[PDB]
Design a protein around this ligand. Structure first.
Ligand SMILES: *[C@@H]1O[C@H](CO[C@@H]2O[C@@H](C)[C@@H](O)[C@@H](O)[C@@H]2O)[C@@H](O[C@@H]2O[C@H](CO)[C@@H](O[C@@H]3O[C@H](CO[C@H]4O[C@H](CO)[C@@H](O)[C@H](O)[C@@H]4O)[C@@H](O)[C@H](O[C@H]4O[C@H](CO)[C@@H](O)[C@H](O)[C@@H]4O)[C@@H]3O)[C@H](O)[C@H]2NC(C)=O)[C@H](O)[C@H]1NC(C)=O
Lengths: 386, 213, 211
């Protein structure tokens, strides 16, 4: 019943005889399945998750230099040194400055200088290696029970592709899903930047000129290639300057245009995955196929409304007393349109039922219940121009 | 355009066991997107019905909801004592604001009872402060509607009134009327009277005192 | 499944305040959260709403500009960082939440208990208690701020026939109320009557004999 209202919806019907029915599930797409004397079911891919992801390398895209420290020596007094030169969180550089009387030296000449600053990462992106088989999918199966828009969650993986799922009152449904997504995780790296994510070529990833931490480094601070975001300036032999090179965030986004983008709605992998499944409905059964026909009268609780796919939704309440019972439903004298919410049943007189049916093109008659007060509603499904 | 919900009546006076019918009118069709709440003072508002006719979780069956275009109805079949509260309707149509009705108060219908009236002069203690407060008490009356006016040396009057919530067990109300004057203005007059007008009283009841007691 | 609100209090006009609403018993991210207020003696006013993800916010004109709704899904908390407070924003503020699958829309909700916000310029002041000497007697509890005040009789021993009237705001900006009791005329000579008034905001505790 979940599909009712979703524009990206498919109505897949099982080939007259054959138990199997092939469907394609993707994010923001719903699928309605029908088969002769079988319940109508609604499928939706709710989440895709990359499990057991091995971090290959982590890159710095925005950095900050702090704790700047300098040491100089007087001319001929050798090379200066700071302890920081041995601290791997620090970026250092040796240069020469003009020394003399006015800057604290007995002699006039080129005195060695050394400038150290603490390289701190403000923003990073991590590249993850994901094993195709480790991609978990979450499918929700909702039966067409007439009850408000109840659903059995089911998890599959390209390995555990085939699962039997039991639906309370309808029996079991066998699902055989394919390891055939539009995703070659082989030689691809899942590049994650905050809330954005993409799938990119391994060699391109490793060849990026940015400071990095290896996959192995357990939340380290010893960024390799710090030089790629740091610059030392000493043009007049008066002073050495250390300067940060500015956020590569937007630059990265631009580099990543001709890449497979992955979206992250509510901080999860909710894109580029599509699952081609096969469905066996031989163990499925219509709920209340044993119940008797409704005798009483029906009321129209909400005005009949048309869905985006030409189908119509009728919310009705039972006034009679036979419940639990089968609702008599039909769409002059000869049958015309088809039912989507197959074998509509009443559970309680108080609880209304939602019946989805496909009316025929043009004028039709929606007849709900049996006499007296048997509802004889009118529909108009006009034809469409190019 | 802005959706306004109109609730009628403002107050509904009934007896336990009766059927209550409350209406809510939308300024435009809001389809079926209408909710009903029960609000007791010193309690958070409680959702009863949503989608015009759907009973919320645990809500008893005596509560019923129905629609007819822009006109919505809340029905309570067998009124019980704990159903005596304030009822609000709320629109959940389309996009916010999900505005409310002005509310309907469901009150206990009881036999008419005239107010027993008392007048209190300012305390000796208070006058020392340069201000005088004269209080009039209207005790245990029904219906709620009452009028009290102050007369100083017979000249109609500087007063504020406050009413209690309907009594939990006898279903009556009580009212305080406070007359405030400077000790100076208080001392330049002699007779202080409170005249009460109520349904249960054939003619106005007056209670007075003389400042020279 | 609950919502606990906090941060209510006395604030001066033109002033500012921040309200909190801690959510428990559900996936906070799956609920559109809302702020509903009720001024004393007025009805419920739907004031603001925020998406389950924090993405988008709605504000009723009555608050649009001065009030900012926000939320922390890690800390399961809704906020009504309310600045530029005026006396008309004096009300009980409730947070409400409902499972939402589309922006701010919901069906079944959850309500907190409310938090009182008082926007006033008046200073905290204790009441002056005067006696109001079947017979009827009482106490006049005049010129206190803010609410509430509690009145009992003979230290809770006298309950039957007691009517403590709701407080009324004077033009002074201070509250005043009366608490009364009806007793047999015969008991006036045999029983002492003392009202026990307590205005906790000003540390005022007063016992007055009505005779
Ligand atoms: C590099 O410089 C660091 C500071 O850098 C400057 O400020 C920042 C903002 C830069 O962007 C830049 O502009 C400047 O260069 C300097 O940091 C200092 O390090 C010590 C620890 O070694 C910190 O001490 C700990 O402080 C916390 C609480 O202090 C906070 O105060 C305010 C309010 O939150 C913030 O402004 C501060 O940043 C702090 O976060 C204490 O709780 C803590 O006590 C416990 O731990 C120590 C061990 O460190 C124990 O001995 C104690 O007994 C306690 O159990 C520390 O006292 C200090 O806050 C921090 N200063 C600042 C201003 O950040 C650091 O020394 C330099 N780093 C290197 C590698 O040289």
């Amino acid at each position: 019943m979940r599909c009712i209202g979703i524009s990206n919806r498919d109505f897949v019907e099982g080939v007259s005889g054959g138990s199997w029915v092939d469907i394609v599930l993707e994010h923001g797409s719903c699928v309605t399945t029908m088969a002769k004397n079988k319940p109508t079911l609604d499928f939706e891919l709710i989440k895709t998750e990359a499990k057991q992801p091995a971090t290959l390398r982590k890159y710095c895209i925005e950095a900050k230099l702090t704790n700047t420290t300098t040491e100089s020596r007087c001319p001929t007094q050798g090379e200066p040194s700071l302890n920081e030169e041995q601290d791997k969180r620090f970026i250092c550089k040796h240069s020469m400055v003009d020394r003399g009387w006015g800057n604290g030296c007995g002699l006039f000449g080129k005195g060695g200088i050394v400038t150290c600053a603490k390289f701190t990462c403000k923003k990073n992106m991590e590249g993850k290696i994901v094993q195709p088989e480790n991609l978990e999918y979450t499918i929700v199966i909702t039966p067409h029970s007439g009850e408000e828009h109840h659903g059995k969650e089911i998890k599959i993986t390209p390995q555990s592709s085939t699962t039997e799922a039991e639906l309370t009152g309808y029996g079991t449904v066998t699902m055989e899903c394919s390891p055939r997504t539009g995703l070659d995780f082989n030689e691809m790296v899942l590049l994650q930047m905050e809330d954005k994510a993409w799938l990119v070529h391994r060699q391109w990833f490793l060849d990026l000129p940015l400071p990095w931490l290896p996959g192995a480094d357990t939340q380290g601070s010893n960024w390799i290639q710090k030089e790629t975001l740091v610059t030392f300036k000493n043009p007049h032999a008066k002073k050495q300057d250390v300067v940060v090179l500015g956020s590569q965030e937007g630059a990265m986004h631009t580099a990543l245009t001709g890449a497979t983008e992955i979206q992250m709605s509510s901080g999860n992998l909710l894109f580029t995955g599509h699952l081609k499944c096969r469905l066996r409905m031989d163990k499925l059964q219509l709920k209340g196929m044993s119940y008797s026909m409704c005798t009483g009268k029906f009321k129209i609780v909400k005005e009949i409304a048309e869905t985006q796919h030409g189908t119509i939704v009728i919310r009705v309440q039972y006034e009679g007393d036979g419940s639990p019972c089968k609702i008599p439903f039909e769409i002059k004298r000869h049958v015309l349109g088809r039912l989507i919410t197959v074998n509509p049943i009443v559970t309680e007189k108080d609880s209304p039922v939602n019946i989805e049916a496909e009316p025929p093109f043009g004028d039709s008659y929606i007849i709900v219940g049996v006499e007296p007060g048997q509802l004889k509603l009118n529909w108009l499904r006009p034809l469409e121009s190019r | 355009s802005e959706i306004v919900l109109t609730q009628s009546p403002a107050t509904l006076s009934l007896s336990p066991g009766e059927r209550a019918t409350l209406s809510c009118r939308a300024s435009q069709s809001i389809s079926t997107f209408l909710a009903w709440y029960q609000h007791k003072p010193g309690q958070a508002p409680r959702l009863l019905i949503y989608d015009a006719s759907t009973r919320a979780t645990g809500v008893p069956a005596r509560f019923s909801g129905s629609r007819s275009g822009t006109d919505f109805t809340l029905t309570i079949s067998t009124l019980e004592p704990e159903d005596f509260a304030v009822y609000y309707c709320q629109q959940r149509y389309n996009w916010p604001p999900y505005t409310f009705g002005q509310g309907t108060k469901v009150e206990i219908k009881r036999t008419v009872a005239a107010p027993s009236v008392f007048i209190f002069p300012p305390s000796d203690e208070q006058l020392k402060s340069g201000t005088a407060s004269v209080v009039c008490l209207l005790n245990n009356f029904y219906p709620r509607e009452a009028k009290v006016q102050w007369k100083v040396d017979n000249a109609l009057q500087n007063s504020q009134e406050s009413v209690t919530e309907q009594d939990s067990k006898d279903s009556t109300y009580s009212l305080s009327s406070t007359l405030t004057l400077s000790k100076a203005d208080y001392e330049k007059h002699k007779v202080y009277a409170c005249e009460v007008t109520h349904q249960g009283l054939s003619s106005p009841v007056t209670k007075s005192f003389n400042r020279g007691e | 499944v609950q919502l606990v609100e906090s941060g209510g209090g006395l604030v001066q006009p033109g002033g500012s305040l921040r309200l909190s609403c801690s959510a428990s018993g559900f996936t906070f991210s799956t609920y559109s959260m809302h702020w509903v207020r009720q001024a004393p003696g007025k009805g419920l006013e739907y004031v603001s709403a925020i998406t389950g993800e924090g993405d988008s916010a709605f504000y009723a004109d009555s608050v649009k500009g001065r009030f900012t709704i926000s939320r922390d899904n890690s800390k399961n908390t809704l906020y009504f960082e309310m600045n530029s407070l005026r006396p008309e924003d004096t009300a009980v503020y409730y947070c409400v939440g409902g499972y939402s699958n589309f922006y701010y829309y919901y069906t079944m909700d959850v309500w907190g208990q409310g938090t009182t916000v008082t926007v006033s310029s008046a200073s905290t002041k204790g009441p002056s208690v005067f006696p109001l000497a079947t017979a009827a007697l009482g106490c006049l509890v005049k010129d206190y701020f803010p609410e509430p005040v509690t009145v009992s009789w003979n230290s809770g021993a006298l309950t039957s026939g007691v009517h403590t009237f709701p407080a009324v705001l004077q033009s002074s900006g201070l509250y005043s109320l009366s608490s009364v009791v009806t007793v047999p005329s015969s008991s006036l000579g045999t029983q002492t009557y003392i009202c026990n008034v307590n205005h906790k905001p000003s540390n005022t505790k007063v016992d007055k004999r009505v005779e």
